[PDB]
Design a protein around this ligand. Structure first.
Ligand SMILES: Nc1nc2c(ncn2[C@@H]2O[C@H](COP(=O)(O)OP(=O)(O)OP(=O)(O)O)[C@@H](O)[C@H]2O)c(=O)[nH]1
Ligand SMILES: [Mg+2]
Ligand SMILES: [Mg+2]
Lengths: 368, 296, 330, 51, 84, 108, 20
RNA sequence: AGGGAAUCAGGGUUCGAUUCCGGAGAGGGAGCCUGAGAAACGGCUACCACAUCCAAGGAAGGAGGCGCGCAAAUU
RNA sequence: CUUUAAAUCCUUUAACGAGGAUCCAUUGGAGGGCAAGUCUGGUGCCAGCAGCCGCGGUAGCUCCAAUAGCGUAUAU
């Protein structure tokens, strides 16, 4: 029994849920009412990434490219080398791999080549800082669990390289994350490639200017890569991370405009805007950040038939649609209960998400 | 030195207690326990089934077919099924059985079917097993009877865990086993406890009590060979079940469940009261394919 | 809202701010003010965690009604339930027998699919015959009972899986076949014939399921044989291994050895006969010696899966079910 | 009880058997094995060292 | 007469079983047989067989422009340091 | 010094089979090959235990429950390897000798 | 029509070393 | 203050045998009825505490097994 | 038969019941034997580990100690 969908939006989650459930999916009318009707190259690059990291898959593409049929195979790990398209960031592909990493047959050792930092897609600095501790909460922690950035990349040239390694686990542990905690420290990363090193420092004194009143402890790292490590295009940006007592992480990031289009951004404005964006996240703060809401829900459904609870902020349109696909594929329905928090003066209202997992195990892992 | 000896003995006691910690997924209200009766073809399986039923309900049952659910105690119910000598039946019941009663002919001795079923049980998850040996009336209460009991008991202890009980049925008074032996046998079933098996815990399963064909009658007249819609009633066991799922029925094939709905429980446990014994109202027999009283 | 244009849009997992706060007034800053800082053994701790989870599972949905509870956690064990099944074969209803039990087994994820299953297998100690590879056999796995054609192989220390002709008399053995997906760690049982009665023990073999994959990777040993015809001390001229000069060029430098155990190397092709070549050796050869080279050839298994349909039989012949016959019966 | 494990393994005493020359090459002579080659190999090595 | 849905599947299974039973009694092809000489196998058969075998010795290195440049880089370095 | 020993004053201990480190390495020594890693349930410590004979590894799988006893004497019998202080006696409360000789079948 | 057990199953000697 | 105390009998050293008690209570404290002998090993009344049947009005009552994969002489 | 309230048990006693007498004693310790077989390392032909698995085929070796008994682990 194969599911049918229409459109190109939400393409990644439809493919990721299909290979985990094992049920084929049909996609129709991709960018039909457009000058270019067929698939975009970055979507085709994503499909090629799935083919290498699985075994036994069958994929059908129309000559027009308007429809797609995907028959999932078993997940096979090992060493993989991929060249990501420069139109979308590496973090665009890295989210899907983070969902599929623990259920491979062999531990995944993949090196990704493309663009690391971008405005459209989340930065790999954010995923390293925030997404990886969340998987460690589920018990996927290991000595080989790491993200390492070999060289940075900025559009349009790109030229960045990251390596990802994750252990394999038979079953996922349940979690009960109901206390968000209180924010102790703020950590940040300032980077500049193919430009003067002064750009990094001009971002630091603006972000610190706003955030020093709330917290005494803020320290921002500065990174400057030279030579081939710099990439092929100039740019600069800032990523900010806030740590709580309970161990949760909240993040925000911004990047400068590409060389080809857009006016140059003042480094002081970038530092001020990124700090204000982080404060917006704190007003919306929960146990997980807004980007990682969909990742947290997926790992909860794959538990060993136990009740799990998470406290997260306002629901994103991405996560609301993700919840609908979870009911379509895995037939799970969460119980939703909002928290008023009217007089505690934490900020905006929070939503408590609870569910019971479906019986799921790693079928690809080899018993010896 | 006595304290050191006491210290060492406590550690050995702790060692036996150790096992893998696991979340207890047993239901708050358990379903009726599945009890299977098997043996060689003419050992007395069906005669034993009537004796256990008469021990608990006083309700008359004739033409016993399929599973029979009875109330045996304040907090326990039993589903009793007979296992034929056909090998296909032996394989399916071992997957679903919670308690196994094996019948052994003491006069003839051990047979092939007794050992085959033990190998089946070891493969698919070993349930609680109690062996009952009959036909002891052929012996003359002498050295031969005493030695035959010991010979069969030691061989029986190799297949199963040591300490597993063997029950003795001396003889029949009027074609029924003695009431004291049956009552003692029923006491052992009541107080037994069960471990969680791996396959049964992970997968939901149902032993169907009633079947009903739900098709348009005119479709059968048009074509007898048409595919038919079938409704099934039974107790849910093992794990939770979703609305739209794939189920395998052994001997037929794979199917997908269209509609699911719960029903008020028949043969239900009593509301708690401190009466010494259950009256005739509380003792219930549910057997839709067997025929209760006089009606079949 | 959740459970009660947008297409052709960007796949971005970002929460854009519809209405950002000023962050310059003190009242806005005040809203987020509180968010900032102003002897038991290892076995006992594990046991404590399980009890807390056990209490949490039972005491989660007790408030909601049963109809509400079904949507969130499904039908719990201990409920009397009614199941409606469609597309049942007609022979089930007409040939129904109340004595034969009916069991409904819930399937997990991907268990409806088919694939390659690698198993650890040992022939049963009380079975008289042994199992030959590439002969039909019925497996009792999970909920299913089906007949397939398996391959028996043995593991080597380097990791190679080489094909075996027969099941070994006293050892475990790898088994691979094409069939339904089944979770790891489960036991399985082997029979030769469900129909008919046999005086001897009927259980053929027993083991556990190990692996699931889409490729078998099983290989078989293949030897190409040649004979010397001209000898010059170490160097000898070999014929019979190949039949063309193209064949020799593909296998130059291959390690070859004699039955006597002298190791050699293929050096260069010879023109005067069609497929001869020149080979050097450790020591001088005799005319009676036979040379061969060791090669590995991948094998394949047919995809044949025949489930047992004993209930789809008339009432008198449910015991008599037959399928594909083995080599001896043919 | 390591010796007990070895004794159980050596319960069967059938050993692997030797294969003979093929029939169509019988006039050539006996198919030599490692034990046969070692006799002529050591004989040649003995003479060369003396020379 | 009319044929049942289960009976239709049985007919397809029976054809498949018959084909498989033919293969068992048939003579095995030369690839599956061990210890095969050139006479039994057809001409030029191994070219498409894709067998696996081991090589006795390392192949001789191939000279290219890249190896020339790296070697000249080594020579130039010794010249600068007078590392004779 | 009542609790001095690694077994906490007991003569035997129970553990969970983590991996067969000897099998994963491709060395055919048959002394490395019979080394397995288990984690004691009582205290969570990880030790390396010895399987009496090659081919009893086939009976053991990962995540199984085994009984481990001390290795008091005859340590020098194994070929030039340190750390021979533990040995696997039972799996699933069944002795390895009974499984090897074909006197009992492992219950699942 | 009764399938009695063999001598091997009755006495599970198994792999026992042979003695004179 | 389970333990004793005694007793009889006996060739190859006794793996002998038996007997004797300090009282009290009958769901909990009081009151009461008979007989030679009891403030009863048994009835009753009031109070306190439990629990069963019902047509809802009313009526009747006074010890041991497991927790060691293990409950038959509890006959 | 006798026994006993009745029966069982003990003691008597009629008839069958052995050549591979297969009507087949075990536990622990130490050795021998092997192929067109596999792996690893080298000192060309070697060594270690090990060997019911080989091209095709599926219709029950020896010695030592105790003996209806005999080992292992921890503490001593
Ligand atoms: N003498 C004696 N006969 C017994 C005993 N137990 C069962 N039987 C015989 O078993 C017969 C009854 O057979 P069933 O009740 O049908 O038992 P079954 O094993 O289910 O036989 P099937 O129904 O054919 O499977 C009786 O007539 C008895 O002769 C016993 O303990 N002693
Ligand atoms: Mg019957
Ligand atoms: Mg004689």
């Amino acid at each position: 029994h194969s599911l049918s969908y229409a459109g190109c939006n939400f393409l990644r989650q439809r493919l990721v849920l299909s290979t985990l459930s094992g049920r084929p999916v049909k996609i129709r009318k991709i960018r039909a009412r457009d000058d270019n009707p067929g698939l975009r190259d970055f979507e085709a690059s994503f499909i090629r990434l799935l083919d290498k990291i699985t075994n036994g898959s069958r994929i059908e593409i129309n000559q027009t490219g308007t429809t797609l049929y995907y028959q999932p195979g078993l997940l096979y790990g090992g060493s993989v080398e991929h060249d990501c398209s420069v139109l979308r960031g590496i973090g665009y592909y890295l989210e899907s791999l983070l969902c599929l990493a623990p259920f491979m047959k062999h531990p995944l050792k993949i090196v990704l080549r493309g663009v690391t930092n971008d405005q459209v897609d989340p930065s790999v600095d954010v995923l390293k800082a925030t997404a990886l501790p969340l998987l460690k909460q589920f018990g996927i922690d290991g000595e080989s669990f790491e993200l390492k950035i070999v060289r940075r990349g900025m559009p349009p040239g790109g030229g960045g390289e990251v390596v990802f390694s994750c252990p394999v686990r038979k079953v996922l542990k349940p979690i009960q994350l109901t206390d968000p905690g209180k924010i102790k420290r703020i950590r940040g990363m300032a980077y500049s490639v193919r430009v003067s090193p002064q750009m990094a420092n001009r971002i630091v004194d603006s972000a610190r200017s706003i955030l020093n009143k709330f917290i005494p402890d803020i320290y921002i790292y500065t990174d400057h890569m030279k030579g081939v490590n710099s990439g092929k295009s100039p740019g600069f940006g800032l990523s900010l991370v806030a740590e709580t007592t309970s161990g949760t992480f909240l993040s925000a990031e911004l990047a400068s405009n590409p060389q080809g289009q857009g006016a140059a951004v003042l480094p002081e404005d970038l530092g001020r805007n990124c700090a204000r964006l982080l404060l917006e996240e704190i007003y919306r703060g929960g146990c997980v950040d807004s980007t990682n809401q969909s990742l947290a829900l997926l790992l909860m459904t794959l538990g060993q038939q136990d009740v799990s609870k998470v406290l997260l902020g306002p629901l994103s349109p991405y996560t609301i649609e993700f919840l609908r696909h979870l009911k379509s594929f895995f037939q799970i329905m969460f119980k939703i209960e909002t928290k008023p928090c009217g007089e505690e003066l934490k900020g905006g209202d929070k939503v408590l998400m609870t569910c019971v997992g479906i019986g799921f195990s790693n079928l690809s892992k080899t018993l010896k | 030195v006595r304290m050191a000896r006491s210290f060492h003995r406590t550690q050995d006691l702790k060692t036996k207690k150790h096992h893998i910690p696991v979340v207890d997924r047993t239901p708050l209200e358990p379903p009726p326990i599945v009890v299977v009766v098997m043996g060689p073809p003419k050992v007395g399986k069906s005669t034993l089934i009537q004796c256990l039923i008469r021990n608990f309900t006083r309700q008359k049952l004739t033409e016993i077919r399929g599973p029979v659910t009875i109330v045996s105690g304040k907090k326990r119910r039993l589903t009793i099924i007979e296992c034929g000598c056909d090998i296909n039946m032996m394989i399916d019941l071992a997957k679903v059985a919670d308690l196994v009663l094996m019948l052994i002919d003491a006069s003839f001795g051990f047979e092939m079917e007794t050992f085959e079923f033990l190998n089946i049980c070891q493969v698919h998850g070993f349930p609680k097993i109690m062996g009952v040996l009959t036909h002891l009336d052929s012996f003359k209460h002498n050295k031969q009877l005493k030695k035959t009991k010991k010979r069969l008991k030691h061989r029986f202890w190799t297949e199963v865990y040591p300490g597993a009980k063997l029950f003795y049925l001396s003889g029949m008074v009027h074609g029924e086993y003695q009431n004291q032996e049956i009552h003692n046998l029923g006491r052992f079933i009541t107080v037994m406890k069960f471990r969680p098996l791996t396959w049964q815990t992970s997968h939901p399963y149902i032993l169907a009590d009633r079947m009903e064909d739900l098709t348009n009658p005119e479709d059968i007249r048009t074509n007898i060979k048409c595919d038919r819609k079938v409704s099934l009633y039974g107790y849910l066991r093992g794990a939770h079940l979703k609305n739209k799922s794939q189920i395998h029925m052994p001997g037929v094939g794979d199917f997908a469940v269209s509609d699911i709905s719960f029903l008020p429980d028949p043969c239900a446990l009593p509301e708690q009261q401190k009466k010494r014994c259950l009256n005739e109202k509380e003792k219930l027999v549910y057997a839709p394919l067997s025929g209760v009283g006089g009606v079949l | 809202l959740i459970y009660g244009h947008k297409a052709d849009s960007l796949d971005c997992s970002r929460f854009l701010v519809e209405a950002p706060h000023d962050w310059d007034l003190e009242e806005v800053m005040n809203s987020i003010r509180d968010c900032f800082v102003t002897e038991s053994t290892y076995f006992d701790d594990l046991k404590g965690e399980m009890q807390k989870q056990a209490q949490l599972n039972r005491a989660e949905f007790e408030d909601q009604d049963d109809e509400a509870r079904v949507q969130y956690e499904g039908f719990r064990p201990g409920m009397y339930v009614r199941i409606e099944i469609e597309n049942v074969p007609c022979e089930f209803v007409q040939n129904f027998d109340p004595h034969y039990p009916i069991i409904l087994g819930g399937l997990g994820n991907s268990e409806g699919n088919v694939g390659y299953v690698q198993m650890r297998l040992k022939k049963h100690r009380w079975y008289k015959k042994i199992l030959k590879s590439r002969d039909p056999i019925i497996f009792s796995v999970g909920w299913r009972r089906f007949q397939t054609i398996p391959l028996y192989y043995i593991e080597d220390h380097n990791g190679r899986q080489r094909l075996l002709k027969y099941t070994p008399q006293h050892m475990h053995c790898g088994a691979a076949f094409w069939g339904p997906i089944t979770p790891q760690g489960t036991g399985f049982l082997a029979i030769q014939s469900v129909s008919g009665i046999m005086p001897d023990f009927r259980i053929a073999a027993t083991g556990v399921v190990l692996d699931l994959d889409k490729s078998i990777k099983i290989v078989k040993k293949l030897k190409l044989t040649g004979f010397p015809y001209k000898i010059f001390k170490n160097t000898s001229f070999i014929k019979g291994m190949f039949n063309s000069a193209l064949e020799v060029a593909k296998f130059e430098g291959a390690v070859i050895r004699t039955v006597s155990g002298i190791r050699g190397q293929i050096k260069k092709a010879l023109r005067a006969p069609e497929g001869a070549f020149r080979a050097s050796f450790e020591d001088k050869l005799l005319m009676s010696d036979i040379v061969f080279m060791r090669t590995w050839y991948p094998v394949s298994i047919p995809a044949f899966y025949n489930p047992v349909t004993s209930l789809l039989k008339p009432v008198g012949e449910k015991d008599t079910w037959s399928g594909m016959r083995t080599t001896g019966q043919l | 009880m390591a010796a007990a494990f070895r004794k159980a393994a050596k319960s069967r005493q059938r050993e692997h058997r030797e294969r003979s020359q093929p029939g169509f090459r019988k006039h050539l002579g006996l198919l030599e094995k490692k034990k046969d080659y070692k006799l002529r190999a050591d004989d040649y090595r003995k003479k060369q060292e003396y020379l | 007469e009319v044929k049942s849905s289960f009976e239709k599947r049985q007919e397809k299974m029976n054809e498949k079983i018959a084909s498989l039973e033919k293969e068992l009694l048939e003579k095995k092809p030369w690839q599956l047989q061990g210890e095969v000489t050139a006479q039994k196998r057809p001409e030029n058969s191994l070219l498409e067989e894709t067998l696996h075998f081991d090589h006795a010795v390392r192949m001789a290195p191939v000279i290219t422009e890249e190896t020339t440049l790296q070697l000249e880089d080594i020579i130039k370095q010794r010249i600068r340091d007078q590392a004779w | 010094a009542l609790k001095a020993n690694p077994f906490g004053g007991a003569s035997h201990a129970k553990g969970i089979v983590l991996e067969k480190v000897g099998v994963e390495a491709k060395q055919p020594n048959s002394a490395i090959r019979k080394c397995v890693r288990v984690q004691l349930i009582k205290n969570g410590k990880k030790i390396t235990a010895f399987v009496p004979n090659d081919g009893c590894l086939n009976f053991i799988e990962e995540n199984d429950e085994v009984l481990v006893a001390g290795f008091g004497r005859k340590g020098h019998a194994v070929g030039d390897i340190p750390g021979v202080r533990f040995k696997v006696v039972k799996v699933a409360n069944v002795s390895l000798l009974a499984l090897y000789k074909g006197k009992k079948e492992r219950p699942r | 029509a009764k399938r009695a057990i063999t001598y091997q199953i009755a006495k599970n000697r198994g792999l026992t070393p042979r003695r004179k």
